[PDB]
From a paper:
The primary mode of resistance to aminoglycoside antibiotics is through chemical modification catalyzed by aminoglycoside-modifying enzymes. Here we present the first structural and functional studies of two aminoglycoside-modifying enzymes that do not use target mimicry, AAC(3)-Ia and AAC(3)-XIa. X-ray diffraction studies reveal that these enzymes bind aminoglycoside antibiotics in a conformation where the central 2-deoxystreptamine ring is in boat conformation. Similar to other AACs, AAC(3)-Ia and AAC(3)-XIa display the GNAT superfamily fold.
In contrast, all five structures of AAC(3)-XIa contain both protomers of the physiological dimer in the asymmetric unit. Despite a tenfold molar excess of antibiotic to enzyme during crystallization, electron density maps of AAC(3)-XIa only allowed for the positioning of one aminoglycoside per physiological dimer. The experimental maps of the antibiotics in all AAC(3)-Ia and AAC(3)-XIa ternary complex structures presented in this report unambiguously place the aminoglycosides’ central ring in a boat conformation rather than the canonical chair conformation. Additionally, in all of these aminoglycosides the N-3, O-4 and O-5 atoms of the central ring were positioned in an axial plane rather than an equatorial plane, positioning the prime ring of aminoglycoside around 90° to the central ring. The shape of the pockets rationalizes these enzymes’ preference for 4,6-disubstituted aminoglycosides, as any hexose substituent at O-5 would provoke steric hindrance. In the AAC(3)-Ia and AAC(3)-XIa complexes, regions of the adjacent protomer in the swapped dimer contribute to the aminoglycoside binding sites. In the AAC(3)-XIa structure, the swapped dimer regions are folded closer to the aminoglycoside, creating a more enclosed pocket than is observed in AAC(3)-Ia. In AAC(3)-Ia, the aminoglycoside site is opened and easy for ligands to access, whereas in AAC(3)-XIa, the aminoglycoside binding site is closed off and the enzyme would require a conformational shift to accept reactants and release products.
Numbering used by the authors:
A (entry chain B): 7 to 148
B (entry chain A): 6 to 148
Amino acid sequence: IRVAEVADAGVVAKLLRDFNTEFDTPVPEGLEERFAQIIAHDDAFVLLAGDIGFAYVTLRPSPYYDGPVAMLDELYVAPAHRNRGVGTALLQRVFEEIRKHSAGELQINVDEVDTDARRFYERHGLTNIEQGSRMLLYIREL
Amino acid sequence: EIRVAEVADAGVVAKLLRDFNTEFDTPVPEGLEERFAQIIAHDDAFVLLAGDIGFAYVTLRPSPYYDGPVAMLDELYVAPAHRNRGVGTALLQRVFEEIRKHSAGELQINVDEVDTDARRFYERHGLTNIEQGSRMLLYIREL
Ligand SMILES: CC(C)(COP(=O)(O)OP(=O)(O)OC[C@H]1O[C@@H](n2cnc3c(N)ncnc32)[C@H](O)[C@@H]1OP(=O)(O)O)[C@@H](O)C(=O)NCCC(=O)NCCS
Ligand SMILES: CC(C)(COP(=O)(O)OP(=O)(O)OC[C@H]1O[C@@H](n2cnc3c(N)ncnc32)[C@H](O)[C@@H]1OP(=O)(O)O)[C@@H](O)C(=O)NCCC(=O)NCCS
Ligand SMILES: NC[C@H]1O[C@H](O[C@H]2[C@H](O)[C@@H](O[C@H]3O[C@H](CO)[C@@H](O)[C@H](N)[C@H]3O)[C@H](N)C[C@@H]2N)[C@H](N)C[C@@H]1O
């Protein structure tokens, strides 16, 4: 696993394209050019497991912590390479990398029906319960 | 009325967040004012203030899905004695207005399932918990 460089924007864009296609979710135009800009800056990073898996992490400020709040905005391993520990290794490296940023928390948006992903996340120390209540994510696309 | 907070307003914002956390029996971390002063001054974030009775804290972060950022309404609060009079609605409308200046492609809000009044508020104002026929859950690990 490596932190992506700007030179990796093309492979990151390919993997997100494959991800969204697999899940019948639209593929934005211009992914490679945006990833090249995003990777060049310090409020986000991408981890690559060779060319077959990736984690996209954003950082944003919080008044609760000197460091940022981290969000795992995308986690994906190519279908032929799943169930071999790649995703586990990616997530562990997420924690290691955000720790270098003194991140106070990791947050992940997860669809409720994705029970296999939820089992993976809960196995690795993420929780959806806060004081007996589930935490919900509400959005408005603009 | 509602204004974008300046660095000098950090103390007002910290007070409101303290009151917010005190209302819901949540620990109030130290250094709130000093951190809000830095966040307001330097970071990709902003605070909206309704007088000194309410605020919205919004962060902006990168997205490959569009040119602009994805916005997160990380805190929204109206003092108890001033609720149910449209202040919260006014703050949220101004949130949409300000993030539109940043060409934000999406607004996201984390809401506890048991906060039914807050959920009805967000749902009444164009936010949805449903994506592809499924609820969206927020998973965390505190570090
Ligand atoms: C979820 C995912 C990143 C995990 O990576 P991985 O390399 O397959 O995971 P690991 O080998 O380290 O651990 C296996 C766990 O991953 C989960 N998993 C495996 N395949 C999965 C799949 N198609 N979809 C969802 N979860 C899967 C399971 O929980 C599995 O645990 P199990 O042994 O109890 O069945 C990967 O499977 C994937 O990309 N799935 C589809 C996209 C997705 O769900 N991303 C989650 C972001 S919200
Ligand atoms: C949620 C909140 C920001 C809305 O501000 P507001 O000025 O009361 O809202 P408005 O007057 O514009 O609209 C009224 C709606 O606000 C909601 N509301 C009122 N009091 C509320 C309360 N204690 N908690 C949650 N929502 C409340 C209700 O949905 C109400 O609609 P209703 O008349 O059908 O019951 C404010 O009530 C509040 O600070 N609540 C406690 C903190 C909170 O829950 N924040 C939500 C972030 S997840
Ligand atoms: N079912 C798995 C999904 O994983 C990823 O979404 C990741 C997105 O972060 C989550 O979606 C959120 O993030 C994306 C991108 O910002 C927005 O398009 C979307 N409206 C917003 O809800 C999303 N709800 C879960 C996942 N963590 C894939 N991009 C799509 C795939 O369907």
